[PDB]
Amino acid sequence: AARDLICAQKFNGLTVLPPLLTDEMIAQYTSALLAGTITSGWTFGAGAA
């Protein structure tokens, strides 16, 4: 079709690095925080759940 802006950005020496944590790992961290705060309350942040 037409040349994209991403190709013009990359082709002139400007790259974009990917983040270290993917969206699935952020979702797993959020799931762990929800499971802790539902099952245990505030006790999982002060030590053992």
Partner: protein, 31 residues
């Protein structure tokens, strides 16, 4: 990608943004 030179001198290189079917001028594909 190397560890410290006091430990070892083995080197692993990463070509960023391209697949390794065009890099020549243990192969692993990464995002």
């Amino acid at each position: 990608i190397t560890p410290g030179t006091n430990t070892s001198n083995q080197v692993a290189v990463l070509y960023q943004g391209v697949n390794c079917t065009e890099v020549p001028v243990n192969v692993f594909q990464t995002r």
